[PDB]
Design a protein around this ligand. Sequence first.
Ligand SMILES: *[C@@H]1O[C@H](CO)[C@@H](O)[C@H](O)[C@H]1NC(C)=O
Ligand code: NA
Lengths: 99, 7, 276
Amino acid sequence: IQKTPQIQVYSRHPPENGKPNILNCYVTQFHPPHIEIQMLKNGKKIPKVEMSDMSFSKDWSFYILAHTEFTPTETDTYACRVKHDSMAEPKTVYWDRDM
Amino acid sequence: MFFINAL
Amino acid sequence: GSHSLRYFHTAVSRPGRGEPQYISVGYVDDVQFQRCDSIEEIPRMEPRAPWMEKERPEYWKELKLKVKNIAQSARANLRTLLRYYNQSEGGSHILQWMVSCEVGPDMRLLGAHYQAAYDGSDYITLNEDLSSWTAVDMVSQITKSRLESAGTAEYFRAYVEGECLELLHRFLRNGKEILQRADPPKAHVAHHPRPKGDVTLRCWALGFYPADITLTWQKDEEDLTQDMELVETRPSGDGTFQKWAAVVVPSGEEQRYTCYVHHEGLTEPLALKWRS
Ligand SMILES: *[C@@H]1O[C@H](CO)[C@@H](O)[C@H](O)[C@H]1NC(C)=O
Ligand code: NA
């Protein structure tokens, strides 16, 4: 089979401008397991992104968590960019402080 | 940590 | 109340450069305790939960040999499955299986599971009785026939009643503080005006363990199942989980709407409205 990733970008704790936090990119519902995940701040790749081990659910689809430290502010933009073989091109999802 | 040969 | 030891195994026949030919992750309930893999035939193991620091060196030496033997066996099985499914030699194919055992509150065994998938689809399943198998097609029927003639489920039951039970008992004891617990959700309703004059109501639940939860919106006397946007439950990264559910509603009617939260850590369903 082939299954397309679902992507969620969100903070560990409710965000407050100026206070350190953790930014999560949770990618689920994909098959096969090869996947490429990057995170970006203000248009620059973030080098220090931690990756959990990959696992899978009872329907056999895989899931993984990437995360990095961040400090939200009123102007800084954050994104997670994902590429999987089910996709012709990468997909970028921006962090939204309300979701 | 267990595996059964399918064939 | 019950507890489970669960392993999630993956083997890949032509992994990318640097990628594992074999990887497995082990959990107790919703907490990961280790990673095992084999990359270019070198086995590696890493702990992921703090109680694993209490394991003796003999645990890891035995585990290393299991990893080498399983990876070799899964590789051989991928080679046979390619032939039986009349597939070409160039592509990469995927073998997955799940192994678990389950105990009740009093640590009594309640059941176990062995289930396998090829290329993301069910292949064979061990039944409730831990003696017969369920196949999906004629290839897996051959597997079933051979397993039942050989009596091979006997040796899985011996694993369940031996090493699976031993580890679940020891991990529940050494990890009691982390594993024998329920953290209830901390829940609130957020309010977001939209450029067209209506409003988004977003019901949040944070900081709960275990992961299983239900969030529902309800209108006075009207069902909102098709109306709400519900995100898949997600890890916060600190050992707790979060989720939200949202509905779009007309300005001025926000008090017609109610969010209900159901979780193991609550005494009863929690009911929330937008406070203002
Ligand atoms: C593979 O081909 C052989 C010979 O044509 C056939 O007997 C067998 O059923 C095929 N396998 C599957 C899974 O269809
Ligand atoms: Na046998």
